[PDB]
Chains A and B, each alone.
Chain A
Amino acid sequence: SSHRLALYRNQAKSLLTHGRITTTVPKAKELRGFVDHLIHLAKRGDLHARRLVLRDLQDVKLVRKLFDEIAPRYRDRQGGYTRVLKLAERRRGDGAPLALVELVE
Chain B
Amino acid sequence: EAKAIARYVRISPRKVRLVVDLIRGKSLEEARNILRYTNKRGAYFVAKVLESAAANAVNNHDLEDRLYVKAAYVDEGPALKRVLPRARGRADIIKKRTSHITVILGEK
Instruction: Classify chain B: how many residues form its interface, as a range.
Output: under 10
Interface of B is mostly: loop
Count chain A residues whose beta carbon lies closer than 8 angstroms to a beta carbon of B: 2
Chain B hits for A44, CB < 8 A: none
Which residues in window 31-62 of B have CB below 8 A to A?
39-40
CB distance from B26 to the nearest CB of A (A): 23
Produce 1/0 per residue, A67-105, CB < 8 A to B: 000000000000000000000001000010000000000
Chain B contact residues, CB within 8 Å of chain A: 39-40
The 3 lowest CB-CB distance pairs between A and B, nearest first, are A95-B39, A90-B39, A95-B40
- What would 3 A/B residue contacts be, using CB atoms closer than 8 Å? A90-B39, A95-B39, A95-B40
